[PDB]
C-alpha cells in the first residue's frame, strides 16, 4: 500500500506517491467555465483558456469554493494520477493559522466523498524543513496565496512566533499586470493574467539595491528583456522585472502597510527565546514558488544582516527544487511507518467525526 | 491571523507530545536505546533505521546519513543518564536519507521524553562535541542506495 501526497497549493496542485522524489502531477488549481454566459479542471481548463473564465477555489490558503475544490481533488485522483482513492492513505497540506473549519471539511470530504482509508493534514513549512534535512530552522514559505514564517526547534514549531501574510505570488502577478500598463501593454482578463504570470516567472528578479537598479534602468536598456507573446508581438519589459518582486520587501507597492518578508522573518525570530535565535538566523530555509526569483536569497541575506546583531551569523538556504520542497518532505515522512501510525483511519473518523483531525494532526 | 480557533491551537500542548510519544513506540530501533553510558549508531537505509555494528562505530559512509545517540552521566547526578543525539549527514547523502535522519532524530528525542539535545552534523562541519565521541573519525567512500524512486 502506497500513500498519496497531495500538496494543495492556492495556485498549483502538486500530487504524487510517497517514496517518489518528485510529484508526478503538477497542474493549476483552477476550474474553468465559459467566459460567455459545463466546466473544466486543471490543464484542460488552461487548454481552453481562450473561451473560459478561470477561478481558483483556494484563496490565501483557505478553501473558499468547496464544490470546485471537490472537482480539483476528483480530477487529481481519477484523471491525473489515475488511482482509486479508497486504496490510498492520503497526506494533505495546509498553511499554518488557517481557521480550524478548513481541515475539518478537508477530513470530511476525504473520508465521506473519496472514502480514503486513512489521512493526515500536515503543516507545509514543517515538511519543507525536513526536506532540507534539518530539525531546527525558520522556514519562509511563499506560494501563490500565502507567505508564512515558521520557526522550528528540535522538530517542534513554535506557534507564538508563526507569522503569516496575505501577500504572495498572485499579488505579484496582479501587480505586474498593473505596471505593465505604464508601458502601453494591456493585460486584464483572467486569461491574460496567466500570460503575465509566465512573464513574471521567466523575467523577474529581486534587485540587491532597488534604488540603484531603478537608476540603472532609467539610464540605459541594459536591463531590458524581450518577450514573445502568443500572437508573435514582441514586447519589452524593463524596471518591471525587479519592481514586481520588490513588493515582497516593500508591500506599500500594492498599498499594504505590512512588514516585508525580511522584516516578518526578523520579527518571527525575535518572538523566539533568545538562546535559539542564533540557530534560526543560521538556518533560514526558503520554500515555495515565490521564493524562486533570482537574487532573492542574496537580498534576504543583506536585509536580515541589517536587522540582526552585528555579531550574528546569517545564512539563507535556497534549495534548488524548493518549488517542490513541501511535497518532497511529505513524500519522505509518508514513507515512514511511525509517521503513518499517527494518521486518522476511516474507523476512527466513523467514531469521532471531523474533530479528530485536531487531536491527531500536528 | 491569530492562534485561537486556528489549526495551530493544539501545537505546543501536552496532547501533541502525547501523540508523538506514542508514535515513537512503533520503531524497533529505539527499544533498549539509551540504557547505559556509551555511543549507539544507526544508519538510514531506504527509509529504515538500521543499527550499525559496534565494531564499525566511528566509520561513516560519505553517501549516507546516520543517527548517533551519546548517553552520558550529567553533572547534576552521577547515577542518571542524559543524552546528545547527533545526526550525521554525508557530503553525498541523498535528500530522502537526510530527511529521514532528521525526522527520526526528533522521534528518538520524543522516545526519550524530550531529554536529548539535538545536533546536526554535516560532513566537514562536525561539532567539537561530535568529534570528541571518537577519541577517530573515518570517512568511507560509497554508501547505500537512495530509497527514492526517481520520477523521470
Ligand atoms: N521562477 C519563478 N519566479 C517567481 N515566481 C515564481 C516562479 N515559479 C513560480 N512562481 C510563482 O510561484 C507561485 C506558485 O508556487 P507554489 O509554491 O506552487 O504555490 P502554491 O503552493 O500553489 N500556493 P500557496 O497556497 O500559497 O502555498 C505562483 O505565483 C507562480 O507564479
Ligand atoms: Ca546513500
Ligand atoms: Ca530534546
Ligand atoms: Mg504552497
Author numbering:
A (entry chain A): 5 to 41, 51 to 375
B (entry chain B): 7 to 141, 144 to 160
From the article:
Actin is one of the most abundant proteins in eukaryotic cells and plays essential roles in various cellular activities, including locomotion, division, and transcription control. The dynamic assembly of actin is controlled by the hydrolysis of ATP, bound to the center of the molecule.
In Q137A, two water molecules replaced the side-chain oxygen and nitrogen of Gln137 almost exactly at their positions; consequently, the active site structure, including the W1 position, is essentially conserved. Despite the absence of the side chain of Gln137, the polar interactions in the active site of Q137A_AMPPNP were highly similar to those of sWT_AMPPNP, and His161 was in a flipped conformation (χ1 = 61° and χ2 = −84°). In addition, WOε1 does not bind directly with actin residues. The distance between W1 and PG is 3.2 Å, and it is the same as that for sWT_AMPPNP, while the distance between W1 and W2 is slightly longer, from 2.4 Å to 2.8 Å. Judging from the configuration of W1 and W2, Q137A appears to have ATP hydrolysis activity comparable to the wild-type actin. Thus, the replacement of the Gln137 side-chain atoms by the water molecules, WOε1 and WNε2, may disturb the hydrolysis reaction because of the increased fluctuation of the water network in the catalytic site in which the two water molecules, W1 and WOε1, do not bond directly to any actin residue.
